Amino acid sequence: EQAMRERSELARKGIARAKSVVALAYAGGVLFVAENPSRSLQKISELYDRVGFAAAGKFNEFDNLRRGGIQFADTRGYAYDRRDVTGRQLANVYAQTLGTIFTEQAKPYEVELCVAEVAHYGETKRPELYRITYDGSIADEPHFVVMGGTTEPIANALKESYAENASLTDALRIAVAALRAGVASLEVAVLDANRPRRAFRRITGSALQALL
């Protein structure tokens, strides 16, 4: 570990430098809350029908990963079937990609990823949240994932304010609050279970102000 402690070091510092993202399970699915100033650059995105993506770190690096995941998901759905693309599958492939990158690339990717999956329309299954780190380590979380910036104040503010089946309005406030602990400047999205096929929906502008 005379080259690994370094390659890893470089990545962690980069992740630490970056802003914060929160992903939590609620009543109607999964809610993504991120600290994002930019109008057109996004940290939150749709992967597939019921699968969402959230990332923390260096943009060009996590957008590359976002694209590769969409590329993977679309190819998989076509070869087999859509119902066959799962969050576990995507988390698994990010784990394998990040790990390779953190092994043979010029420098390690300075990123932290969250793959989330909600149940199919009219189906009953608890939301799944996966955290994939710079080294390929994969974590499976029952309630929430916190990524980027100062993670501990946000993770502790959430562990105290977390409920099982919170409303959209309630979960949004619990998340905004957690972020301070750890519209504009905010990127917010949901994987909406009641939607028939594509769960992903962006909560922007006037509609975002209206719930708080």
Partner 1 sequence: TTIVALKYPGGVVMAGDRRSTQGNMISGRDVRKVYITDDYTATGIAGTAAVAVEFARLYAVELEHYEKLEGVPLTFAGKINRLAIMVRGNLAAAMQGLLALPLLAGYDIHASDPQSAGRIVSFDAAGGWNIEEEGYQAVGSGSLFAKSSMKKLYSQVTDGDSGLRVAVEALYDAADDDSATGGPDLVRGIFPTAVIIDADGAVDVPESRIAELARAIIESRSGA
Contact flag: residue 74 with partner 1 (CB under 8 A): yes
Site stretch for partner 1 (CB under 8 A), options 73-81, 98-106, 157-165, 184-192: 73-81
Beta carbons within 8 Å of 29's beta carbon, 6+ residues apart? 118, 127, 190, 191, 192, 193, 199
Residue type, 192: D
C-alpha 82/C-alpha 63 separation (Å) is: 23
Q: Is 45 in the site for partner 1 (CB under 8 A)?
A: yes
Query: Closest distance between a second copy and the C-beta of residue 157, in Å?
Result: 24
The beta strand positions in 71-149, using DSSP E, are: 111-117, 128-132, 138-141, 144-147
Out of 71, 105, 165, 185, which residue is the one contacting a second copy (CB under 8 A)? 105
What span, in angstroms and rounded, lies between the C-alpha atoms of 33 and 15? 17
* Region near partner 1 per CB under 8 A, out of 6-14, 67-75, 150-158, 174-182: 67-75
Which of partner 1, a second copy, none is residue 204 near (CB under 5 to 8 Å by kind)? none
Show the site string, 179-208: x = touches partner 1 by CB under 8 A, - = not: -------------------x----------
**18 closest CA partner among 60, 47, 53, 46:** 60
Residue 6 touches a second copy, criterion: CB under 8 A: yes
Verify binding: residue 84, partner 1, rule CB under 8 A: yes
Q: What residues between 13 and 42 interact with partner 1 by CB under 8 A?
A: 42
Q: Contact with a second copy (CB under 8 A): which of 140, 183, 185, 205?
A: 140
Nearer to a second copy, 41 or 177 (CB): 41
User: How many other CB atoms are found less than 10 A from the CB of residue 85?
Assistant: 23
Q: Select 78 or 207, whichever has its Cβ closest to partner 1.
A: 78
Nearer to a second copy, 138 or 157 (CB): 138
Number of CB atoms found within 10 A of residue 33's CB: 24
Query: How many C-beta neighbours within 10 Å does residue 7 have?
Result: 18
Residues 6+ apart with CB under 8 A from 149: 16, 18, 19, 20, 35, 56, 182
Residues forming contacts to partner 1 in the complex (CB under 8 A) are 42, 45-47, 67, 70-71, 74, 77-84, 89, 198
